[PDB]
RNA sequence: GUAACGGGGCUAAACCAUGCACCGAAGCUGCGGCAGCGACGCUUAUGCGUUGUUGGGUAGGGGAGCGUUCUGUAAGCCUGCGAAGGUGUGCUGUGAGGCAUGCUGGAGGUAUCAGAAGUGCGAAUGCUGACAUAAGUAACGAUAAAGCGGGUGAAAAGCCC
RNA sequence: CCCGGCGAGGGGAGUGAAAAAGAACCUGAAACCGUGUACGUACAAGCAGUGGGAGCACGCUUAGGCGUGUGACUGCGUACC
């Protein structure tokens, strides 16, 4: 039998080009450039699932760091004070109240300063 | 009053009034969830912590939905070496609604 | 000397922002002519400041 | 009452017409038709008969006046083409393409 | 296709493309590139397997309770109205008819259906035998189906 | 009643592998069988 | 997993005038940059920096330490003419006194885009051509 | 063109000696979801339980599946009481795919499963078609040039008189 | 019935089940040029995508970082065969 290439490329087009909406230029309308665009994306999307966590952690440490430096000793001595008093899983994402009012964990920081130089 | 708690290896920030997302419970809607694994209660001012996940005070909640997530796609690919593969995943969850935090 | 890739439609429209086509940029309302007054120019019946001066 | 005038298979390309067309775009019919009468350009004469034609059937037939109309839409798209032989060096017989454009005026009430 | 004599090469390496004969199958009408074949496929099957399949299918019609003996599965005339009113009354339409005798008085009758088929019992083939709703036969055809199977 | 509507043993419905079409392949692309050789391109046998 | 998330709303600046008091060129410098990010304080923003609005006004309250009176990097040049041209640590104070402090904070600026996003929050407005006393900001000594 | 500490900056914010901390990868690990397969438990036509190293992968090996044109059951059955096709979104599955549904549409369609194939294009300096491009860029055909008045004509910067 | 040459081309009116069947008429994509609306662009810039995302229209914001579409700004980052 002859096969006129069917309604299968029609279904595959509608899948790819739908994922390829909000893309600039030829990257939404030309299937070749689309296919390419879609691959670059799915690579980005899986990398930044983890990679977001690594980036946010820098900030989570840095809100703790400012608050602690005003309240006495620095951040790394404070994590080791906390390890000394209460073990903990040593939380860095420890509080949303680290962003506003730079007084927080002040009792814990004075303790930490005495416990390490 | 705001507080932080442990649900699994997922760690959870919360206020009073807040709906929050957590790891799958066997629990279904219409039940009460509570976390005594509360690490501190704070507002503008984080307390001093002697034992890990202090047993004093609670976070009360209730389940408002147990379902399963919608389908995200994960693309595995490497240029120049001709490698291309695709996977799906959904993951289950439980949503809890915080009915109050202690004082 | 040639190109490297096919132009996008954003390219074409920006390049014309300062190179498109222009005309006489309107004309005024009349007072004295048989036609409508061409701004600060004489009409073909002639009456602008006075008489049939233009006749063609 | 609302009117389309077209001129299909018209001698200009649509990139070249859009130049003149955006000068009369949204100006209202009566004002637009004056500013265009006193433009001494052949592209401007070409669109003019299609502007006048759109307006002229609206003031007639199933309606009256001109001042009640506005120019709601005005656009141009790439129609057919005629291929012509351009004289060139070493007997090169490269094609030069004569784009006819399909010209659309829409008048309506506001 | 023709192109035994002609090439769109005649020395090239400067210009465009690395293709250079006009009878190529990747042209619109130059032919087809998936290779070529006959699309009828004669196949016999070995004699104990074939006959042992027809034994499978006959057992299946019995497990499903379909085999019949009746007096007078045929009239004496080509006339469709005499047979067709006898089998309708007998509640015996839409049947695989296996004849033990074969003539025009049965074959030109009962034609008033879209579902009616005639085959001979010394040649009953496995593609007829698995299809149709019930198998009606007569006692003579049932004899001759055994003889086809042995 | 039915015909040709059998789901047979594991050998009668055999297909092996097909790799020729689709981009995602393991013998479809990258030459015929390996690279920059005879079987890796048109040819593969001349004599028995 | 789900909770409050970082935004361009959670941002604080306000207006600071940095009147230093004889602090050495780089211990002033690295603090000016630090605050121009907001790393002297909390960020919580994986995106544009929170910063502060910084006026530099002190200009001349700089001192030196070491042999960096003449050896220090400020070398620059252009494709227009060839060679190198230079400026000394003593030159940078002796004319337009602002200039030493300005190109101490300059070189700390990140990448392309973010280092510009910082820059638009800093102000000098040329050495000894000042008018920022008309605001009277939050004072700062260092 | 600063431009080997990568740079700012540092004369102690350096280098060296002793030691501690912290942070720092899909690794290490907990959590939720899952893959295939060994060992053992209930113990089966069909399953389920504890536990376990394990799951980066091309060439290449070996298996299975989808849909498309067509067929076979399709001899039946649904149909202007809205069939093929076209298309936006939502759902759903590991994925190919599948289904719900608004718009369009005015007759055809149908599994499961087995069989046939000119069977999914985006690439071969590929073949054909429509038609895009640097661009409103370049071109004004021995400068046997042209003026102005009147006119053909719906209209005259180049035409005719 | 309207514009125009006597033209090119269309509309309106009226026909028909259908003119989103109008004569190249079958339903109808994509390249192809333009319009219309929403929202974005005047301190800004790299495979143009992802991560976080002001905002604005619409959604009783699910009141619970949110949904749709878009996106200042900015972390991070090198197409496919």
From Swiss-Prot, chain A:
Family affiliation: Belongs to the bacterial ribosomal protein bL20 family.
Its biological purpose: One of the primary rRNA binding proteins, it binds close to the 5'-end of the 23S rRNA. It is important during the early stages of 50S assembly.
Pfam families: Ribosomal_L20
Gene name in the database record: rplT
Complex and partners: Part of the 50S ribosomal subunit. Contacts L21.
Protein name (database record): Large ribosomal subunit protein bL20
The UniProt record lists the keyword RNA-binding: yes
GO cellular component, one term: cytosol
Transmembrane segments: none
Lineage, highest ranks first: Bacteria, Pseudomonadati, Pseudomonadota, Gammaproteobacteria, Enterobacterales
Any one of the GO BP annotations: ribosomal large subunit assembly
Keyword list, A-Z: Ribonucleoprotein, Ribosomal protein, RNA-binding, rRNA-binding
PANTHER family named among the record's database cross-references: 39S RIBOSOMAL PROTEIN L20
GO molecular function term, any single one: large ribosomal subunit rRNA binding
UniProt superkingdom: Bacteria
Curated annotation (Swiss-Prot), chain C:
Transmembrane domains' residue ranges: none
GO cellular component terms, semicolon-separated: cytoplasm; cytosol; cytosolic large ribosomal subunit
GO MF term set: structural constituent of ribosome
Species in which this protein is naturally found: Escherichia coli (strain K12)
Name under which the protein is recorded: Large ribosomal subunit protein bL32
Residue ranges of the region described as Disordered: 1-37
Family: Belongs to the bacterial ribosomal protein bL32 family.
Top-rank taxon: Bacteria
Protein keywords: Ribonucleoprotein, Ribosomal protein
GO biological process: cytoplasmic translation; response to radiation; response to reactive oxygen species; ribosomal large subunit assembly
Pfam annotation, one family: Ribosomal_L32p
UniProt-listed InterPro entries: Ribosomal_bL32, Ribosomal_bL32_bact, Ribosomal_zn-bd
Subunit structure: Part of the 50S ribosomal subunit. Contacts L17.
UniProtKB/Swiss-Prot annotation, chain D:
GO terms under biological process: assembly of large subunit precursor of preribosome; cytoplasmic translation; cytosolic ribosome assembly; response to antibiotic; ribosome assembly; translation
Impact upon substituting residue 8 to C: In strain: SK1048; decreases translational rate, tRNA binding and subunit association at 44 degrees Celsius; does not alter 23S rRNA or uL4 interactions; not erythromycin resistant
Gene Ontology CC annotations of this record: cytoplasm; cytosol; cytosolic large ribosomal subunit; large ribosomal subunit
Binding, L-tryptophan: 90
UniProt entry tagged with the keyword rRNA-binding: yes
Outcome recorded upon mutating residue 91 to A/D/S: Abolishes translation elongation arrest of SecM
UniProt cross-references to InterPro entries, sorted A to Z: Ribosomal_uL22, Ribosomal_uL22_bac/chlpt-type, Ribosomal_uL22_bac/org-type, Ribosomal_uL22_CS, Ribosomal_uL22_sf
Keyword match Membrane: no
Annotated consequence of substituting residue 93 to S/T/V: Abolishes translation elongation arrest of SecM
A single GO molecular function term of this UniProt record: structural constituent of ribosome
Keywords: Antibiotic resistance, Ribonucleoprotein, Ribosomal protein, RNA-binding, rRNA-binding
Domain of life of the native organism: Bacteria
NCBIfam families linked to this entry: rplV_bact (TIGR01044)
Similarity comment: family membership: Belongs to the universal ribosomal protein uL22 family.
Misc. remarks from the entry: The wild-type allele (erythromycin sensitive) is dominant over the resistant allele, and is also dominant over the temperature-sensitive allele at both low and high temperatures.
Record note on quaternary structure: Part of the 50S ribosomal subunit. In TnaC-stalled ribosomes forms part of the binding pocket for L-Trp with the leader peptide and uL4.
Protein name, UniProt field: Large ribosomal subunit protein uL22
UniProtKB/Swiss-Prot annotation, chain G:
Keyword Zinc (UniProt): no
Claim: Ligase is one of the keywords in the record: no
Gene Ontology molecular-function annotations: large ribosomal subunit rRNA binding; mRNA 5'-UTR binding; mRNA binding; structural constituent of ribosome; zinc ion binding
Keywords, in A-Z order: Ribonucleoprotein, Ribosomal protein
GO BP, sorted A to Z: cytoplasmic translation; negative regulation of translation
Example of a GO cellular component annotation carried by this entry: cytosol
A Pfam match: Ribosomal_L13
SUPFAM superfamilies attached to this UniProt entry: Ribosomal protein L13 (SSF52161)
UniProt xrefs under InterPro entries: Ribosomal_uL13 (IPR005822), Ribosomal_uL13_bac-type (IPR005823), Ribosomal_uL13_CS (IPR023563), Ribosomal_uL13_sf (IPR036899)
Domain of life: Bacteria
Quaternary structure and partners: Part of the 50S ribosomal subunit.
Function: This protein is one of the early assembly proteins of the 50S ribosomal subunit, although it is not seen to bind rRNA by itself. It is important during the early stages of 50S assembly.
Family of the protein in this entry: Belongs to the universal ribosomal protein uL13 family.
Protein name: Large ribosomal subunit protein uL13
Organism (species): Escherichia coli (strain K12)
Gene: rplM
């Amino acid at each position: 039998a002859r096969v006129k290439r069917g309604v299968i490329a029609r279904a595959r087009h509608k899948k790819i080009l739908k994922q390829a909406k909000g893309y600039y230029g030829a990257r939404s309308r030309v299937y070749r450039v689309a296919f390419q665009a879609v691959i670059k994306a799915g690579q980005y999307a899986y990398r930044d699932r983890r990679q977001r966590k690594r980036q946010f952690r820098q900030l989570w440490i840095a809100r703790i760091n400012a608050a602690a430096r005003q309240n006495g000793i620095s951040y790394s001595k404070f994590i080791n004070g906390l390890k000394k008093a209460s073990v903990e899983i040593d939380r860095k994402i420890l509080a949303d109240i680290a962003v506003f009012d730079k007084v927080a964990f002040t009792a814990l920081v004075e303790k930490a300063k005495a416990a390490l130089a | 009053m705001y507080a932080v708690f442990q649900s699994g290896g997922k760690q959870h920030r919360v206020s009073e009034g807040q709906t929050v997302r957590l790891e799958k419970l066997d629990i279904a809607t219409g039940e009460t969830v509570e976390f005594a694994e509360v690490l501190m209660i704070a507002n503008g001012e984080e307390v001093k912590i002697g034992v890990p996940f202090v047993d004093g005070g609670v976070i009360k909640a209730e389940v408002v939905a147990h379902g399963r997530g919608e389908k995200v796609k994960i693309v595995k690919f490497r240029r120049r070496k001709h490698y291309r593969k695709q996977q799906g995943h959904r993951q289950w969850f439980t949503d809890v609604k915080i009915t109050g935090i202690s004082a | 000397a040639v190109q490297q890739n096919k132009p996008t439609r954003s390219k074409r429209g920006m390049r014309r922002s300062h190179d498109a086509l222009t005309a006489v940029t309107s004309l005024s309302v009349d007072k004295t002519s048989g036609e409508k007054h061409l701004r600060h120019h004489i009409t073909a019946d002639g009456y602008y400041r006075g008489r049939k001066v233009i006749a063609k | 009452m609302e009117t389309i005038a077209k001129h299909r298979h018209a001698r200009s390309s649509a990139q070249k017409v859009r130049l003149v067309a955006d000068l009369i775009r949204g100006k209202k019919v009566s004002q637009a038709l004056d500013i265009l009468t006193y433009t001494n350009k052949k592209a401007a004469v070409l669109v003019k008969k299609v502007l006048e034609s759109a307006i002229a059937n609206a003031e007639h037939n199933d309606g009256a006046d001109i001042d009640d109309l506005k120019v709601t839409k005005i656009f141009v798209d790439e129609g057919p083409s005629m291929k012509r032989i351009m004289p060139r060096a070493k007997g090169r017989a490269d094609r030069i393409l004569k784009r006819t454009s399909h010209i659309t005026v829409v008048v309506s009430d506001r | 296709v023709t192109g035994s004599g002609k090439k769109p090469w005649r020395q090239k390496g400067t210009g465009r493309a690395r293709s250079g004969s006009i009878k190529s199958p990747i042209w619109r009408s130059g032919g087809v590139t998936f290779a070529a074949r006959p699309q009828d496929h004669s196949q016999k099957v070995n004699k104990k397997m074939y006959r042992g399949a027809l034994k499978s299918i006959l057992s299946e019609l019995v497990r499903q309770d379909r085999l019949i003996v009746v007096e007078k599965f045929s009239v004496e005339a080509p006339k469709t109205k005499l047979l067709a009113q006898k089998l309708k009354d007998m509640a015996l339409e839409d049947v695989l008819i296996i004849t033990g005798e074969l003539d025009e008085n049965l074959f030109l009758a009962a034609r008033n259906l879209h579902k009616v088929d005639v085959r001979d019992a010394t040649g009953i083939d496995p593609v007829s035998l698995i299809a149709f709703d019930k198998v009606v036969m007569t006692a003579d055809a049932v004899k001759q189906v055994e003889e086809m199977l042995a | 009643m039915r015909l040709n509507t059998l789901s047979p043993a594991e050998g009668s419905k055999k297909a092996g592998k097909r790799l020729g079409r689709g981009i995602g392949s393991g013998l479809g692309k990258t030459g015929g069988r390996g690279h920059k050789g005879q079987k890796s391109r048109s040819g593969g046998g001349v004599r028995r | 997993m789900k909770t409050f998330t970082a935004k361009p709303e959670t941002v604080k600046r306000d207006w600071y005038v940095v009147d230093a008091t004889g602090k050495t060129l780089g211990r002033l410098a690295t603090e000016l940059a630090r605050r121009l990010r907001g790393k002297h304080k909390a960020e919580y923003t994986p995106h544009v920096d929170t910063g502060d609005y910084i006026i530099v006004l002190n200009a001349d309250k700089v001192a030196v330490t070491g042999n960096k009176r003449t050896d220090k990097v400020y070398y620059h040049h252009t494709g227009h003419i060839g060679g190198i041209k230079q400026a000394t640590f003593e030159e940078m104070i002796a004319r337009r006194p602002e200039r030493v402090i300005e190109i101490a904070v300059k070189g700390m600026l990140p990448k392309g885009p973010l280092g510009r996003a910082m820059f638009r929050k800093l102000k000098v407005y040329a050495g000894n051509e000042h008018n920022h006393a008309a605001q009277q900001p939050q004072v700062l000594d260092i």
